[PDB]
Design a binder for this molecule. Structure first.
Ligand SMILES: [Mg+2]
Ligand SMILES: [Mg+2]
Ligand SMILES: [Mg+2]
Ligand SMILES: [Mg+2]
Ligand SMILES: [Mg+2]
Ligand SMILES: [Mg+2]
Ligand SMILES: [Mg+2]
Ligand SMILES: [Mg+2]
Ligand SMILES: [Mg+2]
Ligand SMILES: [Mg+2]
Ligand SMILES: [Mg+2]
Ligand SMILES: [Mg+2]
Ligand SMILES: [Mg+2]
Ligand SMILES: [Mg+2]
Ligand SMILES: [Mg+2]
Ligand SMILES: [Mg+2]
Ligand SMILES: [Mg+2]
Ligand SMILES: [Mg+2]
Ligand SMILES: [Mg+2]
Ligand SMILES: [Mg+2]
Lengths: 83, 55, 114, 119, 104, 98
RNA sequence: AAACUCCAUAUAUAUAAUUUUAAUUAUAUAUAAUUUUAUAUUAUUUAUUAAUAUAAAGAAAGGAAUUAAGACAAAUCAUAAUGAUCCUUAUAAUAUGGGUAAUAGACGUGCUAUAAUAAAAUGAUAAUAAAAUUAUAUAAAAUAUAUUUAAUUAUAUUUAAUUAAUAAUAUAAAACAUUUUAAUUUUUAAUAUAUUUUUUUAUUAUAUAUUAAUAUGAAUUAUAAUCUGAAAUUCGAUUAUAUGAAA
């Protein structure tokens, strides 16, 4: 956990266009902190291959952006291993 | 520790002024260590030697 | 006319490999503006200054290109370019410190016996 | 046998250790504070409690987060994580480690214990 | 394999004894976001409720309201923790510092 | 000290039957003598194992109790000594000058 | 092969104004042993001798490096280098994210435990070491904090001295003494008791179970802080309040 006195992790994002025009924000900044001003905004978070669209909620505030954009999908085992 | 703290801190800041030293009685985060850290750029830059060696 | 990096830097005299060139460029750029990084880090971590100053300082730190971060620098073998088991006393990788040592290239190194 | 809030205690064990052990939410420090507040000497046993003393312990220990309340807080926190859609909530649902541990080997106790209804 | 509770012999409600269902209910006062209070006939046993968010504080239901205070569920998040843990870094003047990335 | 010495000497066997693979039909079980250190080791193992059947929580106390009992000729370790010797007798004739 | 070689050992000389101290040391040269001598009891090619012991003269007893020729078409083209072949708007070069950290099963190494020939607290004229590190630094003492008078533990405040036989990393830890320790009714406390007094004895209470997880064990997880970094979500390390699997 980042020290509180340092302040939240902050990154330049096109928030003005999203607040007024409603354009979704597409970013690779998965380490940015969801500030309370991002509630109700449409984000699209990179995951290495594709940008996952999510809309920030009140409960998500304070978390990081990449916490909702999984990078590797669920592990599965092919039972019919054969040989 | 019978001596009052007021006397001890009076000696503390007097010495600090004499010896050109910081005095932060409250212990707040002044960030002094950031500035006082040495610059290592000259040494890190010459890791691969003199680029002007005769060829 | 198509230099791989924004600033035209000189070339190392010894062994050169693409990776070395990258690391060397990072070294020179970090050296150039390490004072700026230190000043910005001070402001962004100072609660005695207005929070706007902290905000802009943090913003400008986050915007600095990768080639000004000290953390980016990785020590490499100056004779082979390998970036594992590099001994700072010689800047030589493993098996190149050994080879050169046996050759007697290193000023005082010896075969360990005790 | 001394019964406090439905918890069975032998007559030989010290109050502080027994309290810290049987109740979910109070540890060594909280038990020490509880015993000190009611004036029970540090190494007093459960035999020597009187009915007023047992009542005071039950009453004073019921003004702080009970076993059920603490478990509710934990479960609510997990539910928050899962409903947000966070990575950690996903690990809880799948019975997998949540603190960045390796799953290629081990990860047995996480599978056995991690769940959305953690105790 | 269905979960079904077995059915007991249904009692005979012979003709003329079909009494109506009058479920126990309480005269319960419903406090809205404003001072408005409406009396609702409810089964749950407690007489007053406050509605944290309701039609009063919903923009959809009050298009003409210039000033409209907004409040949401308080379970944990911005209003709860982000504020007290970060109570020095302040502003929407500050929101203009991270306004745009100036990227095409 | 001499109580322990006589305890070890009386309790420890003089010779034990060590089975050797010699003998295709059956392993040759021939008595073989033991020096003092070997005998003391066997006796000590017996009295320690016997001293571990006592209620105290400190093995200095339980070792002392067993040693006192042995000093008065009261313990089961003697039966083991007799069994080994009877076994050695049961194997009289296979000893060879070699 | 052995020997010369290096660490270590015993001794001699030299250096050090014994405030870089420790001289009980440091490191240069040299000597020493791959020990010698005597006696006897042995088997023998008959002391033109080997092992058995004794005796007496010795400080005298170890480790490291060096692993031949050939064989394994053993490993390495990912230390590096070249032959052949293949790519040249891409198989070369840069940046932002992700992966190398995925988990059914299996497997080789280790760490930590499953309690009383063993774990925990405390021990300030601070019991007792060696070898290493500190110009891309080491960081004492004092402070605020958690936290109570203090101590211990972890951060923050500030840099004392030292770029080193000088100061710091750093009061070594086990050891040893005292106290405690569930299973354990082998315990506690209420009275008396007394030439066991930190203790014995008599009566009452110290319940509910059984092969068992404790005041063993710290896995998993909730929350709040802290450190490094521009950045700790995938994916870092500590502290505190709870959690307390398996064994
Ligand atoms: Mg690095
Ligand atoms: Mg508890
Ligand atoms: Mg001296
Ligand atoms: Mg040789
Ligand atoms: Mg060979
Ligand atoms: Mg051969
Ligand atoms: Mg091959
Ligand atoms: Mg290859
Ligand atoms: Mg190559
Ligand atoms: Mg490419
Ligand atoms: Mg790997
Ligand atoms: Mg190995
Ligand atoms: Mg133990
Ligand atoms: Mg030393
Ligand atoms: Mg030395
Ligand atoms: Mg200190
Ligand atoms: Mg000590
Ligand atoms: Mg079990
Ligand atoms: Mg424990
Ligand atoms: Mg803990």
């Amino acid at each position: 956990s980042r020290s509180v006195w340092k302040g939240p992790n902050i990154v330049p994002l096109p928030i003005r266009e999203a607040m007024t025009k409603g354009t979704p924000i597409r970013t690779n900044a998965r380490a940015a902190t969801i500030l309370p001003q991002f509630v109700g905004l449409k984000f699209q978070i990179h995951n290495g291959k594709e940008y996952v669209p999510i809309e920030i909620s009140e409960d998500m505030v304070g978390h990081k952006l990449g916490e909702f954009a999984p990078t590797r999908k669920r592990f599965s085992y092919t039972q019919t291993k054969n040989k | 520790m019978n001596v009052p703290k007021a006397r001890l801190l009076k000696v503390a800041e007097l010495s600090a002024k004499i010896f050109d030293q910081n005095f932060n009685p409250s212990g707040i985060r002044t960030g002094s260590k950031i500035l006082n850290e040495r610059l290592k750029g000259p040494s890190v830059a010459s890791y691969y030697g003199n680029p002007d060696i005769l060829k | 006319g198509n230099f791989r990096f924004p600033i035209k830097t000189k070339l190392p005299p010894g062994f050169i490999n693409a990776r070395i060139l990258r690391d060397n460029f990072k070294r020179q750029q970090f050296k150039e503006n390490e004072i700026l990084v230190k000043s910005l880090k001070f402001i962004a971590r100072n609660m005695n200054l207005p929070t706007k100053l902290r905000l802009e300082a943090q913003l400008k730190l986050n915007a600095l290109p990768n080639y000004m971060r000290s953390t980016q620098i990785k020590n490499r073998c100056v004779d082979s370019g390998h970036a594992r088991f590099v001994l700072s006393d010689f800047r030589l990788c493993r098996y190149q410190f050994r080879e050169n040592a046996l050759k007697g290239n290193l000023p005082g190194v010896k075969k360990g016996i005790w | 046998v001394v019964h406090i809030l439905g918890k069975g205690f032998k007559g030989k064990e010290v109050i502080k250790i027994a309290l810290a052990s049987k109740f979910y939410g109070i540890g060594k420090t909280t038990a020490e504070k509880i015993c000190s507040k009611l004036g029970l000497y540090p190494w007093m046993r459960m035999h020597q409690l009187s009915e007023p003393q047992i009542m005071s312990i039950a009453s004073e220990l019921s003004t702080m987060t009970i076993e059920g309340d603490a478990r509710a807080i934990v479960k609510d926190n997990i539910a928050l994580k899962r409903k947000i859609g966070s990575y950690s909530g996903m690990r809880h649902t799948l019975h997998l480690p949540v603190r960045g541990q390796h799953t290629r080997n081990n990860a047995k106790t996480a599978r056995k214990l991690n769940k959305i209804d953690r105790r | 394999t269905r979960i079904t509770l077995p059915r007991r012999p249904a009692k005979k409600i012979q003709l003329g004894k079909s009494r109506p269902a009058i479920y126990h209910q309480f005269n319960v006062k419903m406090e809205l976001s404003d001072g408005s209070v409406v009396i609702r006939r409810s089964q749950y046993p407690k007489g007053e409720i406050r509605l944290i968010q309701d039609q009063r504080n919903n923009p959809l239901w009050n298009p003409s309201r210039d000033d409209l205070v907004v409040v949401d569920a308080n379970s944990g998040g911005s209003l709860d923790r982000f504020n007290k843990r970060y109570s020095s870094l302040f502003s929407t003047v500050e929101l203009s510092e991270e306004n745009k990335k100036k990227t095409q | 000290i001499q109580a322990l010495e006589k305890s070890l000497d009386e309790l420890a066997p003089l010779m034990m039957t060590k089975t050797f693979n010699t003998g295709v039909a059956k392993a040759s079980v021939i008595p073989v003598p033991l020096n003092k250190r070997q005998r003391n080791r066997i006796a000590w193992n017996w009295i320690v194992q016997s001293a571990n059947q006592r209620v105290s929580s400190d093995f200095a106390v339980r070792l002392g109790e067993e040693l006192t009992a042995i000093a008065k000729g009261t313990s089961s370790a003697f039966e083991k000594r007799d069994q080994i010797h009877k076994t050695a007798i049961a194997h009289r004739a296979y000893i060879q000058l070699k």
